[PDB]
Amino acid sequence: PKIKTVRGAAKRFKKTGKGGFKHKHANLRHILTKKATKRKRHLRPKAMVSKGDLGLVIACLPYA
Amino acid sequence: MRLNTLSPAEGSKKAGKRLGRGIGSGLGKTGGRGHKGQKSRSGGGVRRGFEGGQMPLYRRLPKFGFTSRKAAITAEIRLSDLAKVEGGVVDLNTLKAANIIGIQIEFAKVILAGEVTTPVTVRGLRVTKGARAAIEAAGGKIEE
Amino acid sequence: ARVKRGVIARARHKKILKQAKGYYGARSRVYRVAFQAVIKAGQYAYRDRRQRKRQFRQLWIARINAAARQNGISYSKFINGLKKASVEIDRKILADIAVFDKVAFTALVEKAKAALA
Amino acid sequence: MELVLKDAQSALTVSETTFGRDFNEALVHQVVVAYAAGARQGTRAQKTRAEVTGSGKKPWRQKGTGRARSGSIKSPIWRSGGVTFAARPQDHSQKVNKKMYRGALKSILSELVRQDRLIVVEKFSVEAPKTKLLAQKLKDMALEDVLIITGELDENLFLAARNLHKVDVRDATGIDPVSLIAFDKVVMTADAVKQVEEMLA
RNA sequence: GUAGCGGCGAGCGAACGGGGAGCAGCCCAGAGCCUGAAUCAGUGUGUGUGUUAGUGGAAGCGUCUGGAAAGGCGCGCGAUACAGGGUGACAGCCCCGUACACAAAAAUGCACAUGCUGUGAGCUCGAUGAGUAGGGCGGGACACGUGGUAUCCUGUCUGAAUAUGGGGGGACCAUCCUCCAAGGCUAAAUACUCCUGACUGACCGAUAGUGAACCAGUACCGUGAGGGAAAGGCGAAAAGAACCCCGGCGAGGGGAGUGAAAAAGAACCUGAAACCGUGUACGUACAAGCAGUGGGAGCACAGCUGUGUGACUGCGUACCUUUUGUAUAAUGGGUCAGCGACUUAUAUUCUGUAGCAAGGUUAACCGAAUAGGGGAGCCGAAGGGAAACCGAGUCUUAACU
RNA sequence: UUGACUGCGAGCGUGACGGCGCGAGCAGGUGCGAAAGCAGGUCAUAGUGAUCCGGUGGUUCUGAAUGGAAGGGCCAUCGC
Ligand SMILES: [K+]
Ligand SMILES: [K+]
Ligand SMILES: [K+]
Ligand SMILES: [K+]
Ligand SMILES: [K+]
Ligand SMILES: [K+]
Ligand SMILES: [K+]
Ligand SMILES: [K+]
Ligand SMILES: [K+]
Ligand SMILES: [K+]
Ligand SMILES: [K+]
Ligand SMILES: [K+]
Ligand SMILES: [K+]
Ligand SMILES: [K+]
Ligand SMILES: [K+]
Ligand SMILES: [K+]
Ligand SMILES: [K+]
Ligand SMILES: [K+]
Ligand SMILES: [Mg+2]
Ligand SMILES: [Mg+2]
Ligand SMILES: [Mg+2]
Ligand SMILES: [Mg+2]
Ligand SMILES: [Mg+2]
Ligand SMILES: [Mg+2]
Ligand SMILES: [Mg+2]
Ligand SMILES: [Mg+2]
Ligand SMILES: [Mg+2]
Ligand SMILES: [Mg+2]
Ligand SMILES: [Mg+2]
Ligand SMILES: [Mg+2]
Ligand SMILES: [Mg+2]
Ligand SMILES: [Mg+2]
Ligand SMILES: [Mg+2]
Ligand SMILES: [Mg+2]
Ligand SMILES: [Mg+2]
Ligand SMILES: [Mg+2]
Ligand SMILES: [Mg+2]
Ligand SMILES: [Mg+2]
Ligand SMILES: [Mg+2]
Ligand SMILES: [Mg+2]
Ligand SMILES: [Mg+2]
Ligand SMILES: [Mg+2]
Ligand SMILES: [Mg+2]
Ligand SMILES: [Mg+2]
Ligand SMILES: [Mg+2]
Ligand SMILES: [Mg+2]
Ligand SMILES: [Mg+2]
Ligand SMILES: [Mg+2]
Ligand SMILES: [Mg+2]
Ligand SMILES: [Mg+2]
Ligand SMILES: [Mg+2]
Ligand SMILES: [Mg+2]
Ligand SMILES: [Mg+2]
Ligand SMILES: [Mg+2]
Ligand SMILES: [Mg+2]
Ligand SMILES: [Mg+2]
Ligand SMILES: [Mg+2]
Structure with missing residues (x-):
């Protein structure tokens, strides 16, 4: 049968042009008052998945 | 050229691994699985994403975004595709007839990709700035 | 495509058992035992090709020593003398001469003694 | 390209792409193998340990008897037991790209002409x-x-x-x-x- | 494997829409008219055509080998028949068949034709499914776990409008579009094979293949439900050994005879190995241990070499597994023979290889077609952004060096 | 007095990763200083918690026939 996407991974990662994945940073859901603005501002933009993690992501998203 | 003088290309046919057929093979005994543990076992191995119990990457990161329904019924047209329609009038229906866009596409954008030599009349589609230049340069016209 | 193993299995066992001819008891009769015996026989043979070269040199030296001492000189001085004399005869030949041509052996000893004198 | 007739001793103009191309052995080999695979019926089976007739009773208790442990009279280790990886009916047919089929035919026909x-x-x-x-x-x-x-x-x-x-x-x-x-x-x-010619363009 | 659902975990997983196979529509909630008219149905009789027995069905001899010819060799012949089986070896022409052409007293299937009986079509004028829809409470089914949650079903309690009306379009309202619940029937394309016939297999070939090639669901086991074996092959033909002899009017054997062969003699093709013997050569009764290996005399034997043996002597603690590490006094194996463990399907990625190349490729299906059709689709040639959207850019930002 | 600013950030440190840290300089607007300047909290290194679900405010996003709305997204922030 067809491989099934890990649906939770598909809600967290999106494939980019050269075939990497973008994700949103952790640590910006709550407890925000104590965090420095600089810290928060740097968590806002989407980041790329790291080399060590790509294998895991790719396995979860066979149709990405 | 006989049934017993035909040969495959060199390198086209590699023999598969046969595990557990003796020392000489290099895959005898454990068959490449090493010694013991979950991964040596029949049916063994952990599921996709599992990292030994540490919160997996796809769970410690937040969900984001939503899926647009409008994106599913929107398409992009290359300049190179404008010549493939019939009649030289590029509209939504002529693009479908030419198998350029899917049947359920409602909106289409012509983008600057490839070249357009012939004059074409684009009607009803959106057109990028660069594509507008290319179409008008080729003698075409864009109708809104 | 079912494959029966009998014919090929028989041939392999027979090959091992032929190599185990002359061995004692199960070692020439029973495949499990014979296979171990034939492997071990192979391991020893490999080792013994090396040991054979050591055993013969040891024998040649002992014989040269006997003959040299009959001619009034030790092995160690004899060999030293021959080297100083630039004689390049090897121990196999010296030992051969010591046994078969004692007069020629005495000539070598004299040559050796002169080189030390 | 001309093909000499035998009976009439005339000529017949044919496409050089069809009757004059080089012999592509690898291509022809793939199509010949595919054709033979397409001929296979693939009708056979054996019984797995699930399909062999017999009960699911454990032959003897797990411990105490001094025997190797057994679970099923149908184990593939046992005489009369299942086949470990019992065959099922199979489809052996292979896909041959249309263009590779036609390419092979042109190679073959061209080679027949060269070999008279x-x-x-x-x-x-x-x-x-x-x-x-x-x-x-x-x-x-x-x-x-x-x-x-x-x-x-x-x-x-x-x-x-x-x-x-x-x-x-x-x-x-x-x-x-x-x-x-x-x-x-x-x-x-x-x-x-x-x-x-028309069939192979 | 999309949209969704989901301790948003594990997992579950549509529809719209497209391509195909197949295609069919009707009736009641009711009277008049029409008249027994569409039409199907029942029951006869015909005509074709299956099925249930069958009939005919071509063409070869010589010579060599052999126990035997169908084999070899030579020279012929048939073929809409060289499928297959049998026959003393592997036969187109010896036999049975096969291609092909014929066949039914009787029963019976199917398709048409046509008597008869029943049947009401068509037209006109009406009628248009209420404890129902909907609702509250509790559950269930829908991909959807009640969630913002539509729609469906209903155990419980209720309860409309009724064509100026009502349902649905994913909370809900308005607008628009679309359909008409609370009555029912309906072929085909689809599923399956206890069973019957024919044909096929890069399926098995007696520990395999059915549990069962054999008098097997038997023997046997169990109070019972139930469990459940082993076990095939003389030869072409029984020509299956008259008769004699030893023996207990034995068993068994030796002759004789049969046969191509009886070390094919029924405990029967072949007849491995473990295991057990008889004979011959050499060694062996002062000699210490994985039993070999290197060296090596002597003896025997066949043509100085080969073969067997091996006094004496250097070295030398099996194998597997598991381990930091095993001669280990850790594990496993009495031995032999047979069997016994990385497969298969689909999806996905990478490598090799082949085709075609900014394109590549078709799925189901059609087709007698491994052809050909079929481009529905799928992947690729554009990305950025959560998204609208923009687009060789785009996002971020009031704006970017 | 409110720089305990808003948008960013060359470059670098440190982590398997999730992350964590240092940062000149640029734009906008500010404070102190005559001015050069300094200020994106505190001499520095502890004072903390991912994701999911949910809440509040905002929003030139989305809005299942259409207009709305619900719901979703995005930005800010909160809770156990
Ligand atoms: K290899
Ligand atoms: K491996
Ligand atoms: K059996
Ligand atoms: K003959
Ligand atoms: K033929
Ligand atoms: K024969
Ligand atoms: K025959
Ligand atoms: K009700
Ligand atoms: K059974
Ligand atoms: K025989
Ligand atoms: K020894
Ligand atoms: K072991
Ligand atoms: K241990
Ligand atoms: K023990
Ligand atoms: K077995
Ligand atoms: K693969
Ligand atoms: K490839
Ligand atoms: K940029
Ligand atoms: Mg937030
Ligand atoms: Mg290795
Ligand atoms: Mg192991
Ligand atoms: Mg371990
Ligand atoms: Mg391991
Ligand atoms: Mg298992
Ligand atoms: Mg834990
Ligand atoms: Mg299309
Ligand atoms: Mg076989
Ligand atoms: Mg039980
Ligand atoms: Mg079996
Ligand atoms: Mg095709
Ligand atoms: Mg005949
Ligand atoms: Mg014979
Ligand atoms: Mg309703
Ligand atoms: Mg109700
Ligand atoms: Mg309701
Ligand atoms: Mg309810
Ligand atoms: Mg509604
Ligand atoms: Mg047998
Ligand atoms: Mg059997
Ligand atoms: Mg008798
Ligand atoms: Mg014979
Ligand atoms: Mg025979
Ligand atoms: Mg026999
Ligand atoms: Mg024997
Ligand atoms: Mg003695
Ligand atoms: Mg002893
Ligand atoms: Mg020793
Ligand atoms: Mg230990
Ligand atoms: Mg040791
Ligand atoms: Mg011991
Ligand atoms: Mg032990
Ligand atoms: Mg153990
Ligand atoms: Mg043991
Ligand atoms: Mg895009
Ligand atoms: Mg301070
Ligand atoms: Mg709407
Ligand atoms: Mg709606």
């Missing part, structure tokens, strides 16, 4: 459906093991060839890669050549 195994004739017919007649005709032409390709499948010729094991009679539409290679000589009617 393709014989072109204006007509090939027998008067009555008599094996004797066809046998005589082929003996006159110095043929024996021959594939005959007509434009229209002459019923007389078909019936005359049935009992000759070395002879085969096809129509141009019904040619196949293996047949072309399998027979010593291929005789094509002028009509058939035209049809094969």
Whole structure:
């Protein structure tokens, strides 16, 4: 049968042009008052998945 | 050229691994699985994403975004595709007839990709700035 | 495509058992035992090709020593003398001469003694 | 490109792409193998440990008896037990890209011409459906093991060839890669050549 | 494997829409008219055509080998028949068949034709499914776990409008579009094979293949439900050994005879190995241990070499597994023979290889077609952004060096 | 007095990763200083918690026939 996407991974990662994945940073859901603005501002933009993690992501998203 | 003088290309046919057929093979005994543990076992191995119990990457990161329904019924047209329609009038229906866009596409954008030599009349589609230049340069016209 | 193993299995066992001819008891009769015996026989043979070269040199030296001492000189001085004399005869030949041509052996000893004198 | 006829001693213009291309052995090999795979019926099975007849009773208790532990009389380790990886009926057919099929045919036909195994004739017919007649005709032409390709499948010729094991009679539409290679000589009617050209563009 | 659902975990997983196979529509909630008219149905009789027995069905001799010819060799012949089986070896022409052409007293299937009986079509004028829809409470089914949650079903309690009306379009309202619940029937394309016939297999070949090639669901086991074996092959033909002899009017054997062969003699083709013997050569009764290996005399034997043996002597603690590490006194194996463990399907990625190349490729299906048709689709040639959207750019930002 | 600013950030440190840290300089607007300047909290290194679900405010996003709305997204922030 067809491989099934890990649906939770598909809600967290999106494939980019050269075939990497973008994700949103952790640590910006709550407890925000104590965090420095600089810290928060740097968590806002989407980041790329790291080399060590790509294998895991790719396995979860066979149709990405 | 006989049934017993035909040969495959060199390198086209590699023999598969046969595990557990003796020392000489290099895959005898454990068959490449090493010694013991979950991964040596029949049916063994952990599921996709599992990292030994540490919160997996796809769970410690937040969900984001939503899926647009409008994106599913929107398409992009290359300049190179404008010549493939019939009649030289590029509209939504002529693009479908030419198998350029899917049947359920409602909106289409012509983008600057490839070249357009012939004059074409684009009607009803959106057109990028660069594509507008290319179409008008080729003698075409864009109708809104 | 079912494959029966009998014919090929028989041939392999027979090959091992032929190599185990002359061995004692199960070692020439029973495949499990014979296979171990034939492997071990192979391991020893490999080792013994090396040991054979050591055993013969040891024998040649002992014989040269006997003959040299009959001619009034030790092995160690004899060999030293021959080297100083630039004689390049090897121990196999010296030992051969010591046994078969004692007069020629005495000539070598004299040559050796002169080189030390 | 011209093909010399045997009977009329005329010429026949044919496409050089079809009848004059180089022999692509690797391509032809793939298509010949695929054709043979397509012939397989794939009908067989054995019984797994699930399918062998017998009960699920544990033969003897897990511990205490001094015997190897057993779970099922149907274990593949046991005489009369299941086959570890019991076969099921299989489909052995392979996909051959349309263009690779046609490419192979052109390689084969071109190679027959180079080896002088393709014989072109204006007509090939027998008067009555008599094996004797066809046998005589082929003996006159110095043929024996021959594939005959007509434009229209002459019923007389078909019936005359049935009992000759070395002879085969096809129509141009019904040619196949293996047949072309399998027979010593291929005789094509002028009509058939035209049809094969059109079939291979 | 999309949209969704989901301790948003594990997992579950549509529809719209497209391509195909197949295609069919009707009736009641009611009277008049029409008249027994469409039409199907029942029951006869015909005509074709299956099925249930069958009939005919071509063409070869010589010579060599052999126990035997169908084999070899030579020279012929048939073939709409060289499928297959049998026959003293592997036969187109010896036999049975096969291709092909014929066949039914009787019963019976199917398709048409046509008597008869029943049947009401068509037209006109009406009628248009209420404890129902909907609702509250509790559950269930829908991909959807009640969630913002539509729609469906209903155990419980209720309860409309009724064509100026009502349902649905994913909370809900308005607008628009679309359909008409609370009555029912309906072929085909689809599923399956206890069973019958025919044909096929890169399926098995007696520890395999059915549990069962054999008098097997038997023997046997169990109070019972139930469990459940082993076990095939003389020869072409029984020509299956008259008769004699030893023996207990034995068993068994030796002759004789049969046969191509009886070390084919019924405990029967072949007849491995473990295991057990008889004979011959050499060694062996002062000699210490994985039993070999290197060296090596002597003896025997066949043509100085080969073969067997091996006094004496250097070295030398099996194998597997598991381990930091095993001669280990850790594990496993009495031995032999047979069997016994990385497969298969689909999806996905990478490598090799082949085709075609800014394109590549078709799925189901059609097709007698491994052809050909079929481009529905799928992947690729554009990305950025959560998204609208923009687009060789785009996002971020009031704006970017 | 409110720089305990808003948008960013060359470059670098440190982590398997999730992350964590240092940062000149640029734009906008500010404070102190005559001015050069300094200020994106505190001499520095502890004072903390991912994701999911949910809440509040905002929003030139989305809005299942259409207009709305619900719901979703995005930005800010909160809770156990
Ligand atoms: K290898
Ligand atoms: K491995
Ligand atoms: K059995
Ligand atoms: K034939
Ligand atoms: K003969
Ligand atoms: K034979
Ligand atoms: K025959
Ligand atoms: K109700
Ligand atoms: K059984
Ligand atoms: K025999
Ligand atoms: K020894
Ligand atoms: K072991
Ligand atoms: K241990
Ligand atoms: K123990
Ligand atoms: K077994
Ligand atoms: K693969
Ligand atoms: K490839
Ligand atoms: K940029
Ligand atoms: Mg937030
Ligand atoms: Mg290795
Ligand atoms: Mg192990
Ligand atoms: Mg371990
Ligand atoms: Mg391991
Ligand atoms: Mg298991
Ligand atoms: Mg934990
Ligand atoms: Mg299309
Ligand atoms: Mg076999
Ligand atoms: Mg039980
Ligand atoms: Mg079995
Ligand atoms: Mg095709
Ligand atoms: Mg006949
Ligand atoms: Mg025979
Ligand atoms: Mg309703
Ligand atoms: Mg209700
Ligand atoms: Mg409701
Ligand atoms: Mg309810
Ligand atoms: Mg509604
Ligand atoms: Mg047998
Ligand atoms: Mg059996
Ligand atoms: Mg008797
Ligand atoms: Mg014979
Ligand atoms: Mg026989
Ligand atoms: Mg026998
Ligand atoms: Mg034996
Ligand atoms: Mg003694
Ligand atoms: Mg002892
Ligand atoms: Mg020792
Ligand atoms: Mg230990
Ligand atoms: Mg040790
Ligand atoms: Mg011991
Ligand atoms: Mg032990
Ligand atoms: Mg253990
Ligand atoms: Mg043991
Ligand atoms: Mg895009
Ligand atoms: Mg301070
Ligand atoms: Mg709306
Ligand atoms: Mg709606």
